[PDB]
Amino acid sequence: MKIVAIGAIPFSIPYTKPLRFASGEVHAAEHVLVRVHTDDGIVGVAEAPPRPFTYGETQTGIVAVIEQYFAPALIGLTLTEREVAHTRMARTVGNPTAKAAIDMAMWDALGQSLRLSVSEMLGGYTDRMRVSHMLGFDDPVKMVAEAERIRETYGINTFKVKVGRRPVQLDTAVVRALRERFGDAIELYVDGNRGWSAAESLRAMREMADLDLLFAEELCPADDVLSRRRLVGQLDMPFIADESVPTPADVTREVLGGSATAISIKTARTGFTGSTRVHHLAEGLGLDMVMGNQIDGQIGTACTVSFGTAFERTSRHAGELSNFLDMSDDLLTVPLQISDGQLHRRPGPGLGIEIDPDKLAHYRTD
């Protein structure tokens, strides 16, 4: 189980319809397929989604850091030296998805080598997660229609509404429309992606005080430090930190500082080894945690469910596992299937997925 090579292949798949939010937009999945090759002939895989508006990474930069720094530093390590890999990669600051992809690809290879799923190796608490769908910006009536279509089609009963627009009433009207349309049959929460000021955020939440929102996520910039802390202290529900807590150290600083009261865990940025560190820190401190979506393709979604199903604290909440549906196509030989509002972790070893050679050849851009 020795790593003999690590590759990073850029690919691009168009979205049937773009996902729009406060901090940016995604019109195509211009990701990087990361592969870890072992001396047993096993190939572990994962993807790295460049999100310049979130971590500052670019598709070109991800391939570069992996080919120029991480690959040469990790070749030669066995799949059971994760902490050595973790420590070596840590010598380089940032580059979250690049690091995470390598770690998850390593876990995929390990699982295949041992004939064990990543989920069970991580803890195997359960075998499925409830699904939450992120609704991107669009005309009010159009967002409601999207939710209705999605719930009827896939059985999804949890929706995270993207907000952060002006006037604030535009978004609060959307949320109210959703609650009037579905009643208490669905769970609802919001993510502003740093779009509103803390003052606008409070007014928006006060206006939606009767809509039973489960969480408020990054309503205003965490970097508007003092007003952010004041806002978090004014809200009843937990305030989920996402882009502001990419590392365990950030979780500690933001939570102890009062700028976060709940933690988003995204395998795209902390992989499995790092995500375990975040989960244990959040559980130890006593904070709610939710599996988030990095606008993942099916490869990243398979990773999210693999980790989310391994622990009780992550599976007690619905996981954001459905945005891959807006992609026009994907790289798996067998597409992920959501039914009854749930997604099961794959039964196969490792991530339980396989890359379709023809799909890769068609969408790669190198």
Ligand X SMILES: O=C(O)C[C@H]1C=CC(=O)O1
What part of residues 241-270 is at the interface with Mg ion (CB under 5 A)? 242
**Nearer to Mg ion among residue 130 and residue 269 (C-beta):** 269
Residue 284 touching a second copy (CB under 8 A): yes
Torsion sign, CA atoms 121, 123, 126, 131: negative
Among 20, 82, 203, 316, binds a second copy (CB under 8 A): 82
SS (H, E, C) the chain: CEEEEEEEEEEEEEEEEEEEECCEEEEEEEEEEEEEEECCCCEEEEEECCCCCCCCCCHHHHHHHHHHHHHHHHCCCECCCHHHHHHHHCCCCCCHHHHHHHHHHHHHHHHHHHCCEHHHHHCCCCCEEEEEEEECCCCHHHHHHHHHHHHHHHCCCEEEEECCCCCCHHHHHHHHHHHHHHHHHCEEEEECCCCCCHHHHHHHHHHCCCCCCCCEECCCCCCCHHHHHHHHHHCCCCEEECCCCCCHHHHHHHHHHCCCCEEEECHHHHCCHHHHHHHHHHHHHCCEEEECCCCCCHHHHHHHHHHHCCCHHHHCCCEECCHHHHECCCCECCCCCCECCEEECCCCCECCCCECHHHHHHHECC
**Least Cβ distance, residue 286 to a second copy (angstroms):** 7
Residue 69 touching a second copy (CB under 8 A): no
Which partner, Mg ion, ligand X, a second copy, none, binds residue 215 by CB below 5 to 8 Å per kind? none
Residue 296 among known ligand-binding residues? no
Which residues does residue 46 pair with via DSSP β-bridges, in sequence order? 34
**Nearer to ligand X among residue 273 and residue 294 (C-beta):** 294
- Six-digit token pair at 54? 């979130």
Strands 158-162 vs 216-217: parallel, antiparallel or unpaired: unpaired
Among 108, 171, 191, 330, binds ligand X (CB under 6 A): 191
- With contacts defined by CB under 5 A, how many residues of the chain interact with Mg ion? 3
Residue 10 touching ligand X (CB under 6 A): no
**Least Cβ distance, residue 248 to a second copy (angstroms):** 4
**Least Cβ distance, residue 22 to ligand X (angstroms):** 8
**Nearer to a second copy among residue 227 and residue 276 (C-beta):** 276
- With contacts defined by CB under 8 A, how many residues of the chain interact with a second copy? 33
**Nearer to Mg ion among residue 103 and residue 191 (C-beta):** 191
Residue 330 among known ligand-binding residues? no
Residue 191 among known ligand-binding residues? yes
Residue 38 touching ligand X (CB under 6 A): no
What part of residues 99-118 is at the interface with a second copy (CB under 8 A)? 114, 116
**Nearer to a second copy among residue 53 and residue 125 (C-beta):** 125
What part of residues 283-312 is at the interface with ligand X (CB under 6 A)? 292-295
Which partner, Mg ion, ligand X, a second copy, none, binds residue 252 by CB below 5 to 8 Å per kind? a second copy
Which partner, ligand X, Mg ion, a second copy, none, binds residue 54 by CB below 5 to 8 Å per kind? ligand X
Write out the catalytic residue numbers: 162, 191, 217, 242, 266, 294
Angle at alpha carbon of residue 125, lines to 123 and 131, rounded to 5°: 115
Residue 252 touching a second copy (CB under 8 A): yes
Q: Of 320, 315, 318, 314, nearest to 301 (Cα)?
A: 320
**Least Cβ distance, residue 134 to Mg ion (angstroms):** 8
Which partner, Mg ion, a second copy, ligand X, none, binds residue 225 by CB below 5 to 8 Å per kind? none
**67-104 as b/e, with b when 16 or more CB fall inside 10 Å?**
eebbbebbeebbbebbeebbeebeeeeebbbbbbbbbb
Task: List, as residue ranges, the binding site for Mg(2+).
Answer: 191, 217, 242
Interface residue list for Mg ion (CB under 5 A): 191, 217, 242
Task: Enumerate binding residues for a second copy (CB under 8 A).
Answer: 78, 80-84, 86-87, 114, 116, 120-125, 248-249, 251-252, 256, 276-278, 280-281, 283-286, 310-312
Residues lying near ligand X in the complex (CB under 6 A) are found at: 21, 23, 51, 54, 134, 191, 193, 242, 292-295
- Binding positions are 191, 217, 242
